[PDB]
Symmetry: D2
Subunit: 371 residues, 4 copies
């Protein structure tokens, strides 16, 4: 069966898997805060079933449920991803992410050592390809890519940045160029922002590559959460993260729109990150079913654009069984006492004194009737 | 292991499981429209793991994933076996469920209806379920027929109706609905589906009062939707334009469900569960909210914290500051869809200026 | 020049259009102080009061309500004179109003003292408005009918009834029996809720086999989030009500609905500006036979826009567009509804809740820690 | 009585008046569509009284209710504006706006209006509501020949004029043409307006040119506008009610304008007399006095401190009103709207359509087969 580059170079669509840590937190197996993957040893059956759900939804990639006991967890996670990839038309991808910010670790040699430790496990397990994901600094992302290409395996690289660029101020087009130069054959974005914002960022990255005359496959794994209110830091800074994000979750129609837009933009590795559940992955695969020539196994429990409803007893329910209905319906929040957007949080008693001095001037103007 | 009545007669809280057909639809194993449970045979591994998630979240009841190239009998037998396997992995009972006869499948007389319930009861007796639930009834008449059939089993019967404060679809009010169910033999009554927790508990209150006026005692049960439905009319969420594929925004947070669980408890509800939309973290929220009353946490709480406490070691001070009940309890969360309304209306049925 | 009286118009089946909300409109213009809401402008700036009465006249109003309250008496005499002046410039009558007062003997002497000026000034009819207790409203009506002039009576209550718990039906019945020839509601609630209340009032009269004309002067503010106490208890009252203001289309909807319910004196209270009154008159123009003078600076359902350069603006020039457009708030960081304020719990009820909360907090912390162990 | 430049050169705040055509449309005197000011002859009492409300609210400028009958309307409007200006500490500004075609032909239209303004001896001239900086520069060139000060404001946002000229450049060109006051009016809410004025100011600093700054934004919230401004919003002009600023919103604007170095602080469509009062109240400590309309008001809700209900009294503070996220009262309606616009060509819509149609037909047969 085909490897990752053989698929992409043949013009195929590679469907990603969804958001493991977020989905498993909801199912009771991951702890928000650490977000660590010990479930791979503690409850492998849960991890295995979620891989299998994504595979059934049409995923071509099983990302390893791994992190930086210890290597026992990582090895176990690799073995589960392998078992499931082998049950269908999927590859295993070993990922690395930016190093933790609460660690002292920060030199090039030491940051690279961290990436090498993780790669060790992935080489021994013989993963199909490698992903450098979840990088806010392109500098650090370049080091990860430099380290991983050495393996002799294809390397994808995604950054968690939006249109404003990385956390130094490096614009996305430039970030993309830098990653391709370091040897990444697949580039794009993951996490932090919704699909709309994510694709704006990938457009900039592609435009960076088009000027500069470089070739690279394009990749997107956005949040399944609507984040029109995000600043450049992404969704963590929203007041609702992580336990109040429910209202923002994409419908399967939102994701069909994303998958079409992504495809139209030239993205051929089309996936999703936090908030993506199996039905969201199926949406990608259904939207692009005519281009691929087939539906995923999960579509046997679905219908095109609500067709499963076309014999409901209620006329107004049957009338929903059309693309035009679902594509255009402005769904309600069910929370009329709540706002539709939030201001991101971010970074004194002198201001309270100044306030108090001004309050008193106005009070006096009014009380002295100075009209 | 204590039976359902021994628990409830002792003043204990019985946490229900969540919404199987909605949860499995999202995971790829149930088709919206028929909503049938053939996964119990085709993908028992998916069904088993979802029962296990609810058990881990604190559920004391595994509802059989039942209904009605594969027969109803086959599915139902397989569903019972899976529910039992997982009930035996913790402090849980198996409930054999029947619901109203399906709306897409023929008009049935009282006799024809009762045969249908008898066919399902035969499996539940063969498998020795712990108790029986008649749920998803919109008409009290049919609900009563189910209860009359089920109580012949010798096992306890719970009965819940998918109705709101205005009553059943023939216009019978909830108080009277509750009275007729208890008279038919049900020892637990309440509501499930169609309405959010707030509306559901309004309905349960009217049921309680009807029982009090009738001098009748029965345990109270609530399995509401996890979806906010302040815009529903008496027909319930099916008539919302967003049913079933646009309901995402309305999904309750865990905090919303904690609030539900406390309200429920205060009203006198002691079988506290959930229906369509309830995922495992939602069940965890019931169990956490009522942990002081019960004396323990569910296993899933090991991958959680009280009211955001898991965030108390985050790098960013503003994320750390979210680690408190006061924060989450009061945070009015944003929809993320500013081009969209907050409520939807349910579906149903010149020349003077020239001068 | 001779002019049909209020009952002559109503008995003949005609639509009487009210004026809008004086205190609110004049507060926005700089002549009334929110808090007291008193009408000293009638002497301090009579030109402002005159011009607002004129605007309502031009919009279609058949009633100039006097801009009156409980110097003092000279303010009320001046207000009556201005209302008279303006009523005489068009097809309008002067209505002298009395409101609830901040002992039966002692309260009726407040109303009597008010009625004196209205009799001296020879108002066309009398209005008992803004009453939250039907008991006191009936006293006003009793005092007022003794003038021999027609008396309308409106309550600021919703579908749950008056502040002593008396339902709207019973309220209407009582008021007709005390001698009111016109009854209904004003203020506190939006047009939708207001018409629910009138419908109950109506049903109450029918059940009593009584007869009276029906009137409505609702808020121009949307209040889906009100409780029985009305808009004052909303967190936004009175300086944050902007978003809630009705469009002229909302008011046309209201006018048709009121007409269809049997309301024949159709006006408005706080928030109604002149273009809202124009909406009532434009909506019921087929029924009345004519348009008000202000329609000369308007068009039916956006027709004035049909000459815009941009095609999308021109497409707005019809009824189906404005009738179905779900207009945006422009405030995405804000909610769509607010919880009304009210009596809290007692201190100490609250301090007891806090102590329990703190106990429970520690019980939860210990439970999580012990499981963790 | 000090003229416009004497006030501004001395560092004083000049408070503008509000939005005449919109306010008078609501009162029954102006027709939406033509938006013409014939009320100046038909109902002078209505125009006069609105001028008087703005004066009472603190306005230091009465803008003439004028347009391009005709000269008679404009003569009457000038006389009414002067009458009211003479009743307080206010000046009369003669306005010219973009024409509804060659340079000298456009300049004839400006010259014809300037003739009335010179005959009436206005205090200063305003070229306002221009979408092309080229036309605005022509206005300014014609108007400066009067020998009176000229202000120039454009109805553009941060993305610049309709020929793509950005705001920094627009400003520099208006000041080079002889405008001593520049800024923006209309089309956008106050937040977006001040973003534009910030760019204008930066353009002047970089070109080393000096001018006084002026802002006359909408009183409507327009976070959903594109660069064409509010006319393209689906609600323009009969559904804009929900968006209207509170007096607190305008106090926030007045403070931000001031901190940016704006000293001619006014408003455009949607500004009513209480919005102007809000500018004057916010800036009252910097000016040393309150407008006369504040006699019928209080600081930040203090007029409520005597209400019968404790929760109403509790509203009588800045901390309350400044932080209250007021509700829309329309839960079945959205918070924003997509602007209307040209969209895509007829043939592209044709293409896009059949492409989408085809996809859906293929999907249908994939489902039927598997
Ligand atoms: N591949 C990871 C991304 C976390 S940002 C997951 O699926 O959880
Ligand atoms: N017990 C069923 C109720 C569906 S209304 C379920 O869990 O899906
Ligand atoms: N007639 C009065 C009612 C105030 S509630 C007014 O128009 O202001
Ligand atoms: N000065 C004009 C500007 C409208 S864009 C007015 O006040 O109406
Ligand atoms: K993924
Ligand atoms: K359940
Ligand atoms: K009125
Ligand atoms: K102005
Ligand atoms: Zn992620
Ligand atoms: Zn359900
Ligand atoms: Zn009122
Ligand atoms: Zn304007």
């Amino acid at each position: 069966k085909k490897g990752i580059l053989e698929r992409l170079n043949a013009g195929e669509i590679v469907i990603g898997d969804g958001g493991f840590v977020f989905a498993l937190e909801k199912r009771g197996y991951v702890k928000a805060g650490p977000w660590t993957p010990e479930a791979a040893v503690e409850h492998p059956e849960a991890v295995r079933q979620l891989h299998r759900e994504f595979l059934r939804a049409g995923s071509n990639v099983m990302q390893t449920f791994t992190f930086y006991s210890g290597q026992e967890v990582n090895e176990a996670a690799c073995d589960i991803a392998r078992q499931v990839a082998d049950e269908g038309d999927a590859l295993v991808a070993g990922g690395v992410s930016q190093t933790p910010s609460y660690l002292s670790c920060k030199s090039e040699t030491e940051v690279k050592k961290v990436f090498l430790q993780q790669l060790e496990v992935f080489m021994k397990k013989n993963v199909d390809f490698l992903i450098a994901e979840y990088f806010e600094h392109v500098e650090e992302a370049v080091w990860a890519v430099e380290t991983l290409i050495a393996s002799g395996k294809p390397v994808a690289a995604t950054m968690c940045i939006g249109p404003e660029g990385d956390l130094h101020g490096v614009p996305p087009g430039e970030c993309a160029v830098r990653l391709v130069k370091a040897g990444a054959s697949i580039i794009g974005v993951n996490c932090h922002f919704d699909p709309t914002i994510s694709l704006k960022t990938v457009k900039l990255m592609k435009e960076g590559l088009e000027a500069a005359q470089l070739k690279a496959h394009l990749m997107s794994q956005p949040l399944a959460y609507h984040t029109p209110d995000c600043n450049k830091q992404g969704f963590i800074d929203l007041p609702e993260f992580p336990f109040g994000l429910e209202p923002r979750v994409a419908t399967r129609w939102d994701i069909q729109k994303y998958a079409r837009e992504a495809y139209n933009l030239g993205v051929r590795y089309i996936g999703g990150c936090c908030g993506f559940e199996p039905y969201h992955i199926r949406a990608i695969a259904e939207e692009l079913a005519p281009e691929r020539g087939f539906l995923p196994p999960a579509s046997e429990k679905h219908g095109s654009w609500g067709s499963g409803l076309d014999m409901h007893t209620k006329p107004w329910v049957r009338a929903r069984a059309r693309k035009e209905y679902w594509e255009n319906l402005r769904i309600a929040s069910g929370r009329p006492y709540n706002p539709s957007m939030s201001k991101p949080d971010g970074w004194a008693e002198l201001m309270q004194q100044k306030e108090a001095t001004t309050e008193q001037q106005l009070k006096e103007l009014f009380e002295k009737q100075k009209f």
